[PDB]
Amino acid sequence: SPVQTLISILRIIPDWSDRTQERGMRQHRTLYDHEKWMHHRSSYRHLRHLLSSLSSRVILSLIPPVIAFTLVAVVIASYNTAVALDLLPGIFPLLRSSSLPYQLTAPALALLLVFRTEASYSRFEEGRKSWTEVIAGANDFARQIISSVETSGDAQLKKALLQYIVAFPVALKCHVIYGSDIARDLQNLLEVDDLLVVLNSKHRPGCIIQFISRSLQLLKLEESRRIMLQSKISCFHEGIGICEQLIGTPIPLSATRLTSRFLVLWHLTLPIILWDDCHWIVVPATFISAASLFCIEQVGVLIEEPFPMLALDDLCNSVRNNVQEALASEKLIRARLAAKG
Amino acid sequence: SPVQTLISILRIIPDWSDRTQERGMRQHRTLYDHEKWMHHRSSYRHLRHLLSSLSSRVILSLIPPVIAFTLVAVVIASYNTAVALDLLPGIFPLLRSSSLPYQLTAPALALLLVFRTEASYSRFEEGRKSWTEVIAGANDFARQIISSVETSGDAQLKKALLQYIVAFPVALKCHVIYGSDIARDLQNLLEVDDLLVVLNSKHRPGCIIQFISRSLQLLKLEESRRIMLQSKISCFHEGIGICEQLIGTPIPLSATRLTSRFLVLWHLTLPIILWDDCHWIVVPATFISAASLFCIEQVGVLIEEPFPMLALDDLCNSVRNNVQEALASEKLIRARLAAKG
Amino acid sequence: SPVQTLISILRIIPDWSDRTQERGMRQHRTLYDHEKWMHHRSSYRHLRHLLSSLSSRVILSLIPPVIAFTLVAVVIASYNTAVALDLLPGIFPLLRSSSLPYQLTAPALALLLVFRTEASYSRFEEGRKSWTEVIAGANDFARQIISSVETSGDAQLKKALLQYIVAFPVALKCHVIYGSDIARDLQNLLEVDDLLVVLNSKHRPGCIIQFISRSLQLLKLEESRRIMLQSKISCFHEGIGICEQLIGTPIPLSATRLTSRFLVLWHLTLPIILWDDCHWIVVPATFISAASLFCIEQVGVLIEEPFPMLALDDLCNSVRNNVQEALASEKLIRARLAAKG
Amino acid sequence: SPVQTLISILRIIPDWSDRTQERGMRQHRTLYDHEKWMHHRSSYRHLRHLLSSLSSRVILSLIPPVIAFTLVAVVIASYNTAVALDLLPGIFPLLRSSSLPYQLTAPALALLLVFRTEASYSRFEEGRKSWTEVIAGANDFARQIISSVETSGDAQLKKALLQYIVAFPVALKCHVIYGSDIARDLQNLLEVDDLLVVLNSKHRPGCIIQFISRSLQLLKLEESRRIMLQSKISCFHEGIGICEQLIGTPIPLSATRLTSRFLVLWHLTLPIILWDDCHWIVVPATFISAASLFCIEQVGVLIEEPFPMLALDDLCNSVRNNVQEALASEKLIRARLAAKG
Amino acid sequence: SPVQTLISILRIIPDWSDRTQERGMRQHRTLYDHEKWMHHRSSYRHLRHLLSSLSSRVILSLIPPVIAFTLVAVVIASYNTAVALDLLPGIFPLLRSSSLPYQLTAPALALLLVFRTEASYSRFEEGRKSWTEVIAGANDFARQIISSVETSGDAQLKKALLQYIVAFPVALKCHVIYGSDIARDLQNLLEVDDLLVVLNSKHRPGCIIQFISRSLQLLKLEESRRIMLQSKISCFHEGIGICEQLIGTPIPLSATRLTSRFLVLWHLTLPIILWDDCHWIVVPATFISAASLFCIEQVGVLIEEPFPMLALDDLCNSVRNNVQEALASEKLIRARLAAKG
């Protein structure tokens, strides 16, 4: 109890930081337009970023490691100040050291920290390209289905097939985001009986592909045209593959634990080597170093699995908006090209 | 009012800098030719870049953050000089510190600043390749349409289809540049009734694709030849996808706010750590450091969304010039190859 | 014997480290899901990584080089302390040097160490993409076989062909992992007589491809449809090629021996240059430098051949689970699309 | 005149440097073979590069910026020496400063300089791959035309078509090199009347493509075989696109002017901060720093537009040599494969 | 003679180093297997690399530049020691300087050295991927020929065609390795009369392609199947293109001479700036700096043209072994799939 009521009060702050950053992963993102870019490039961005630093969830996640190292700096400083005043027995030395060992290893720590964050940014870029390809393939496939499928006996199957190409990016988004309601997001895109078959499947994006693939086998098409249409499905399998490996396989964990351990050991003895030159400036110096260096690691950690930093709902809605515009433009494009003739 | 007439005079300079850089985003760019490369590689480039530094809009955007840090250096220096002359009560210490904490963290700041600018340059390169592919696909598709389409009953549809392949890059350029007049830019490329249907569409580059796709369904072609032609449309969907994700999804904003915050905190205490070694040289030193380090961040910020730094009007005009040269060379190439035979 | 009983006691620790890390290469990995990402991003990761540092097998592999350099620091320190007390003849100088030569070469060592680890991480990423492509191709090929193959006379050949597409990733996994039992892993995927032919082949993933390729020649298909199906086999040859070159061709060994030699020479004279500023702090300083710098090299060494850090059994089971779900959804998707009609 | 006869004598050296480097862009390059690699890897390369440093045109281009900064170092040193001897009124201070501000910003300058040169090398690599693809596509297309085209009535058209595939890389080389004589380079590759049509076209590589595309429409081919042959033309459009964007779009000029300005300001005050430690060694120190740091920038500037550093004439001659060897081997390969049968 | 008998004794060591490294380029390499990876990752690699440092040919190539700089350090040290003892007239100053100029430029030298070696490693990776693609294409093409070619009248042509797909990687290996005996390496792969036609061709890998391309025109195939088979030849043209550009076009030589010149000037004045702090420790310090920094450049130089560091004979033998296993498995796979039916 005496070691169990103190081990629980120490968890109050890290638990709050953990609850705060997870709520920030569930925030809804929006695509940038032109006026958001003007605000992004403004000369006031430096002041407004500094003023928004106590509402940023990166900095709130950094509160446990920054306070822990700052108390260690205060403890080392208090002990050193007490020794300098001869308040201790005399066997107790001053916890000081040369900064030369840290000068030699300072560029290695920086290069390793930036390497891990560059590896994390590469995973964000790969996630962004994969979604770009899936949305451009869904737009392309839908555009070709509106042109290719001519026969009036295939009106219902063409309608059904265009509903599954719009539903596929929504299914993939629900497959990669933790609390997702695919039933709610597909309620007005799929038929009531089509959505029951998808909801009974463990791999829902896989199930929509199978409806698309079976629909292309039932259309009255020449075989050359069908091979052209069913070659557009492979981008959906590629999308599923790339997105599932980014959630399944993180950056090799030996590299991420090395960056953690190196940053913890460096900030544990940093007050000891800074003492001769700084004295009690070790406290604010350790505070600023821990806040600056653990924030480079925190940025990389938060974008390592990148699907919650992407506006997947706005990208999915673009395909739906593009397909309904094209079904309304069809009579007026057909008329104009018949007039040409 | 007393705190509201001073909060407004402080906005005069950042508002001017913001109006100056946005006007520089709307400047018209031209493709480099050989004599511009000779001028670019000249030994006078070092002098002429230095002389053009007060007309460069990067440096004008840097005027608010550089003056703000320079006044902070002047305030810290004035306070320190007043303390050294014993003009203050005596409880007021000298704002000085060891430079050793900044020596240890100097390589981390540099690596992070160059990482953000490299990420911005990667987005410029991706925007450049995407336009290269769309212009080469428009040239290829047009070249094949001039060869493939033979039948004299399809003369008007071939004319119409070649107008939409030239119009597509203009539509995509108007779709990614903020103040664009697609009606003015397509006035002499599309028919009056064809341009009305495009102007009524929310996704105009999408609408031109649908005219191309419907035109290929109405041509008297063998099915194998039609599949070959409609496979050339996918580069247009890819172009739309890549260009829309560069405007919709910026570099993850946690990484860009970290570079901003780190640069602001570093220049706020930089006069304090430089005092013992520099005294009033903290003012020009802080001026040069803020101007040098915030300019690396400013370059990255301005090319992060890269379409205004690209000569999209000259690249679009190349496709138009290439297609009209090919329609004039057609009778003389046909004659020469008939002579061979 | 006197030089042969001491040369054997020195091998006790490196042999134990070598047996410990190899047992860690044979540990079974699991795909990350959402709750493992929450635990990965927690604010307690910094404390729990530090507490798990004496059970991490990277650090146990670092035990021989870190102790060897720490004893060298103790030997140099003991000799220097004995000279300072005039316990030696007097011809014996103090083993001290300026740190200026190491200050000039410190950034070169860091850049080279991070380059070798970045090259190793690039090989891990290439291994990860190759598996992503092979699993997405196996999913795509299986999905098309379930749609394409219609004829009821080809029921047994379609069953057989879907067993070989699920078996191929298991065969490739057994081909790249050292102690593998392909007979045990293919016992319930292949027929008893089909598995005997695969087990008699030296290149088992190659043998499964040949069964797939022969099965596509015996199906009653139109030739255009067969060419479409046999074009899906090339991703399996590409998978075999990429995976075999990662095991056959390491990072050029001249670059890896340079990083080893540079790190050994740097830690051999590091106590000599640190003495004037540190005295007996050369022992913990050399301990921390050797542990920090050889751990960056160790991470790169352990992920250089990356297939044991990948959850190849879970990725292989995903294809098997996806194909059996699709064979159970087939009657209910066929019914729904017939109802449409 | 007094300010106009001195402004002209100062241009003598930069004009000479500009005339010298442009003449080096027009030098003819040759492909490396095995004995040039042995000479390239020799242990004498370090001495022979140092001895050839006053004939290297990079160093001659660096002569204006290196002399300008060296005279500034001499002026600052002369003024400081005159002040130390009390030869001035006494209101004149010594132009000295702490080197600490430059120590903090030294790693930022290095990282930015190497980033710009890496961006320039990436443009050289992209230019090299684009030429590799165009030459391999010209070899592939020619090889297929020699096999595919069988009919004896198409002998003259097959001859003509193989002349245009060899002529296309020569036309593209003349299109990207400033003083080119396409008439002289195509005089023995094209017919006299075919070369007149190409010379009358503004986009000559585009004109050759149109002859190839029209020749494939006039051959007596099955449609499936023609689609296979005309799919080999797209690599030529891709080649034109990639090569034209490298000449049209340089590295964003905001990034290149920042590297210029940073290097000029750094070498202007470098004698002032080096004085206390170096005195008149500021002159050779500034000379070596300006020569070393402006040479990293000069290398990047000279390879930024890379087509003059590539042996485009030797790569073009390889396609011509490969096609004539294949037309002489045709009777003896046909005989051997008929003997098999 | 007096200046000609001394200019020849100085060439003894660089000539020996040049003869030693070229003999190391001709050593035969073997593919890594699992037990070589265990030995590669062992904790004894740090000791065994250090012990093998006087048999490594990188270090033997470094012997001329390391001895030359070490004698310069000995000459500068001897002159400085003689001046300190007043053994000279007195007009002779001490060759000493501040290390501050080298501290500012130390990170630029390191970044440039690692950039050149990263560029060299990128050329090794490109060479490795190109061979991976050619071997996977040869495996794929052979696998399809064994399935596709059915007719019993084409037995000899199928045999011949499978001999040319195995012979092509051997021909490409002989085309990129300096002393190669293509006649000896193709003696048991090609027919005696087929090998005479290949030996009479200047571009032997090109000649084998032409036999493959002519063999596919003589087979009794449907045209759709022939187009599928002749599309597998393009990877051979791509392989030839990528491999020839790596031997023809080195890293731009302006960048490689800059790294050479910078490293030579840096080690020439390094004893002068290290003297005040080191005295005769300038000799071992210059020895270690020259050995460490010129070894990073030497690694890059030796892998810049990478084909001799690749096990091209083992990769070529894998295709031959895979094709003969598949011709022996053909009767037993045909039997098993006929039993299914």
* Cα E94 off chain centre by: 46
Q: How far apart are CA A206 and CA C323, in angstroms?
A: 10
Amino acid at A211: F
Q: How far apart are CA C117 and CA A255, in angstroms?
A: 9
CB pairs under 8 A between B and D: 230
Give the position of tokens 């792969």.
E189
Give A38's Cβ-side CA count (13 Å radius): 15
Which DSSP helix (H) or strand (E) runs through A12?
Answer: helix A12-25
Domains and CATH numbers, chain B: 127-247 (1.20.1440)
Give the position of tokens 């750590």.
B273
Q: How far apart are CA A11 and CA A14, in angstroms?
A: 6
Closest residue in chain B to residue D11, using alpha carbons only: B44
Which DSSP helix (H) or strand (E) runs through E290?
Answer: helix E282-303
Contact E120, E300 (CB under 8 A): yes
Give E319's Cβ-side CA count (13 Å radius): 27
- Cβ within 8 Å of residue C151, ≥6 positions away: C219, C220
Backbone angles phi, psi at A129, to 5 degrees: -65, -35
Q: Where are the alpha helices (H) located in E188-269, listed in sequence order?
A: 192-199, 204-218, 223-230, 234-248, 253-268
Q: How far apart are CA B116 and CA B311, in angstroms?
A: 24
User: What tokens does E26 get?
Assistant: 């001709």
Closest residue in chain E to residue C206, using alpha carbons only: E322
Find the CB nearest B336 among D197, D230, D254.
D197
C244 touches chain E (CB under 8 A): yes
Alpha-carbon Rg for chain E, nearest whole angstrom, is 29
Contact B261, B272 (CB under 8 A): no
B296 touches chain A (CB under 8 A): no
**Selected residues 116-135 of chain C with any CB under 8 Å from a CB in chain E:** 119, 122
Mutation choice for A interface testing from C102, C139, C226 by most A CBs within 10 A: C139
Angle (CA) D122 D124 D130, round 5°: 100
C192 touches chain E (CB under 8 A): no
User: What tokens does E238 get?
Assistant: 């791509």
Which DSSP helix (H) or strand (E) runs through C291?
Answer: helix C282-303
- Cβ within 8 Å of residue B21, ≥6 positions away: A41, A43, B57, B58, B60, B61, B302
Amino acid at D206: G
Contact B117, D115 (CB under 8 A): yes
Q: How far apart are CA E139 and CA E318, in angstroms?
A: 9
Q: How far apart are CA A32 and CA B249, in angstroms?
A: 6
Amino acid at A264: V
Q: C27, exposed or middle or buried, with CB in 10 Å at 0-12, 13-18, 19+?
A: exposed
Q: How far apart are CA A236 and CA A217, in angstroms?
A: 18
Task: For residue C271, list chain A residues with Cβ-Cβ distance below 8 A.
Answer: none
Question: Which residue, E180, E243, E144, E200, is CA-closest to D139?
Answer: E243
Chain D closest CA to B225's CA: distance in Å?
7
Backbone angles phi, psi at C150, to 5 degrees: -110, -45
- What subunits touch chain A, counting only 3 or more CB pairs under 8 A? B, C
E65 touches chain C (CB under 8 A): no
D108 touches chain E (CB under 8 A): no
Q: Do E285 and C101 touch (CB under 8 A)?
A: yes
3-state secondary structure chain B: CCCCCHHHHCCHHHHHHHHHHHHHHCCCCCCCCHHHHHHHCCCCHHHHHHHHHHCCHHHHHHHHHHHHHHHHHHHHHHHHHHHHCCCCCCCCCCCCCCCHHHHHHHHHHHHHHHHHHHHHHHHHHHHHHHHHHHHHHHHHHHHHHHHHCCCHHHHHHHHHHHHHHHHHHHHHHHHHCCCCCHHHHCCCCCCHHHHHHHHCCCCHHHHHHHHHHHHHHHCCCCHHHHHHHHCCCHHHHHHHHHHHHHHHCCCCHHHHHHHHHHHHHHHHCHHHHHHHHHHHHHHHHHHHHHHHHHHHHHHHHHHCCCHHHCCHHHHHHHHHHHHHHHHHHHHHHHHHHHHHC
Q: Do A21 and C31 touch (CB under 8 A)?
A: no
Q: How far apart are CA E140 and CA E134, in angstroms?
A: 10
Find the CB nearest C299 among A97, A244, A255.
A255
Question: Which residue, C194, C290, B98, is CA-closest to A278?
Answer: B98
Contact A190, A206 (CB under 8 A): no
Q: How far apart are CA E305 and CA E302, in angstroms?
A: 7
User: What tokens does B309 get?
Assistant: 């730094």
Q: Do A250 and C334 touch (CB under 8 A)?
A: no
Task: For residue E245, list chain D residues with Cβ-Cβ distance below 8 A.
Answer: 128, 131-132, 315
How far are the Cα atoms of A136, B34, B232 from residue B236, in angstroms, in the given order?
9, 30, 8
Q: Do B264 and A228 touch (CB under 8 A)?
A: no
Contact E183, E199 (CB under 8 A): yes
C310 touches chain A (CB under 8 A): yes
D331 touches chain E (CB under 8 A): no
Question: Which residue, B212, E276, B293, is CA-closest to A333?
Answer: B212
* Cα E195 off chain centre by: 28
How far are the Cα atoms of A328, E54, E55 from residue E60, in angstroms, in the given order?
76, 7, 8
A279 conformational bin, left if phi > 0, alpha if psi -120 to 50, beta if neither: left
User: What tokens does D236 get?
Assistant: 């030529």
Length of chain D: 341
Question: Which residue, A325, D212, C37, C331, is CA-closest to B209?
Answer: A325
**Selected residues 15-44 of chain D with any CB under 8 Å from a CB in chain E:** 31-34, 37-38, 40-44
Find the CB nearest B41 among D14, D21, D223.
D21
D239 touches chain E (CB under 8 A): no
- Cβ within 8 Å of residue E116, ≥6 positions away: E251, E255, E256, E259, E297, E300
How far are the Cα atoms of B14, C5, C215 from residue A217, in angstroms, in the given order?
62, 77, 21
Contact C219, C149 (CB under 8 A): yes
User: What tokens does A136 get?
Assistant: 């451009």
How far are the Cα atoms of A124, A209, B206 from residue A163, in angstroms, in the given order?
29, 12, 19
B309 touches chain A (CB under 8 A): no
Q: Do D241 and B322 touch (CB under 8 A)?
A: no
Closest residue in chain A to residue B244, using alpha carbons only: A132
A296 touches chain C (CB under 8 A): no
Angle (CA) E150 E154 E155, round 5°: 90
First to last CA, chain A: 90
Q: How far apart are CA E44 and CA B199, in angstroms?
A: 72
How determined? cryo-EM
- Cβ within 8 Å of residue C214, ≥6 positions away: E147, E333, E334, E337
Amino acid at D55: S
Contact D182, D198 (CB under 8 A): yes
User: What tokens does E146 get?
Assistant: 């064994």
- Cβ within 8 Å of residue E212, ≥6 positions away: E161, E164, E165, E168, E233, E236
Per-residue buried b or exposed e for A32-50, using 16+ beta carbons within 10 Å of the residue's own CB: beeeebeebbbbbbbbebe
3-state secondary structure chain D: CCCCCHHHHCCHHHHHHHHHHHHHHCCCCCCCCHHHHHHHCCCCHHHHHHHHHHCCHHHHHHHHHHHHHHHHHHHHHHHHHHHHCCCCCCCCCCCCCCCHHHHHHHHHHHHHHHHHHHHHHHHHHHHHHHHHHHHHHHHHHHHHHHHHCCCHHHHHHHHHHHHHHHHHHHHHHHHHCCCCCHHHHCCCCCCHHHHHHHHCCCCHHHHHHHHHHHHHHHCCCCHHHHHHHHCCCHHHHHHHHHHHHHHHCCCCHHHHHHHHHHHHHHHHCHHHHHHHHHHHHHHHHHHHHHHHHHHHHHHHHHHCCCHHHCCHHHHHHHHHHHHHHHHHHHHHHHHHHHHHC
Amino acid at A149: V
Q: What is the DSSP string of A264-327?
A: HHHHHSHHHHHHHHHGGGHHHHHHHHHHHHHHHHHHHHHHSS-GGGS-HHHHHHHHHHHHHHHH
Question: Which residue, E43, E45, E49, E36, is CA-closest to C14?
Answer: E43
Give the position of tokens 């070694």.
B277
Contact D189, D169 (CB under 8 A): no
User: What tokens does C340 get?
Assistant: 């449409």
Question: Which residue, B63, B34, B72, is CA-closest to B272?
Answer: B72
Closest residue in chain E to residue C116, using alpha carbons only: E118
Q: How far apart are CA B83 and CA B103, in angstroms?
A: 27
Closest residue in chain E to residue D135, using alpha carbons only: E241
Contact D278, E98 (CB under 8 A): yes
How far are the Cα atoms of C10, C163, E194, E324 from residue C217, in angstroms, in the given order?
62, 17, 31, 20
Q: Which DSSP symbol is given to A153?
A: G
B317 touches chain D (CB under 8 A): no
D287 touches chain E (CB under 8 A): no
Question: Which residue, E299, E315, E260, is CA-closest to E29?
Answer: E315
Q: How far apart are CA E281 and CA E275, in angstroms?
A: 8
Task: For residue C219, list chain E residues with Cβ-Cβ distance below 8 A.
Answer: none
Contact D266, B293 (CB under 8 A): no
How far are the Cα atoms of C259, D97, E61 from residue E54, in angstroms, in the given order?
16, 48, 11
Q: Do C111 and A111 touch (CB under 8 A)?
A: yes
* Cα E290 off chain centre by: 24
Q: A328, exposed or middle or buried, with CB in 10 Å at 0-12, 13-18, 19+?
A: exposed
- CA atoms B186, B190, B193, B198: torsion sign: negative
User: What tokens does A105 get?
Assistant: 């290893």
Question: Which residue, D178, C305, D302, is CA-closest to E32?
Answer: C305
- Cβ within 8 Å of residue D234, ≥6 positions away: B140
Q: Do A97 and C278 touch (CB under 8 A)?
A: yes
Amino acid at B232: K
Q: How far apart are CA C201 and CA E328, in angstroms?
A: 10
Closest residue in chain B to residue D13, using alpha carbons only: B43
Which DSSP helix (H) or strand (E) runs through C131?
Answer: helix C100-148
Question: Which residue, D324, D323, D320, D327, is CA-closest to D170?
Answer: D320
Give the position of tokens 């405007």.
B247
User: What tokens does A210 get?
Assistant: 């199978």
Q: Do E333 and C214 touch (CB under 8 A)?
A: yes
Q: Do C65 and E45 touch (CB under 8 A)?
A: no
Question: Which residue, D43, C45, C288, is CA-closest to A262?
Answer: C288
- CA atoms A303, A308, A314, A318: torsion sign: positive
E177 touches chain C (CB under 8 A): no
Q: Do E115 and D110 touch (CB under 8 A)?
A: no
Q: Which DSSP symbol is given to E190?
A: S
Kindly report the number of other CB atoms within 10 A of residue A54's CB atom: 7
Question: Which residue, A92, A183, A134, is CA-closest to B237?
Answer: A134
Q: Do A135 and B241 touch (CB under 8 A)?
A: yes
User: What tokens does B237 get?
Assistant: 């969907």
Length of chain C: 341
B64 touches chain A (CB under 8 A): yes
Task: For residue A17, list chain C residues with Cβ-Cβ distance below 8 A.
Answer: 43
User: What tokens does A224 get?
Assistant: 């050359």
Q: How far apart are CA E309 and CA E30, in angstroms?
A: 10
C10 touches chain E (CB under 8 A): no
Give the position of tokens 């592939």.
D140
Question: Which residue, C47, D122, C111, D148, is CA-closest to E214?
Answer: D148
Closest residue in chain A to residue B241, using alpha carbons only: A136
Q: How far apart are CA C332 and CA A194, in angstroms?
A: 10
Question: Which residue, C312, C108, C112, is CA-closest to A248?
Answer: C312
Question: Which residue, A178, A128, A170, A172, is CA-closest to A26?
Answer: A178
Contact D63, D21 (CB under 8 A): no
Q: How far apart are CA C149 and CA E329, in angstroms?
A: 26
Please report, for chain E, how many H helices and E strands are present, in that order.
16, 0
Q: C61, exposed or middle or buried, with CB in 10 Å at 0-12, 13-18, 19+?
A: buried
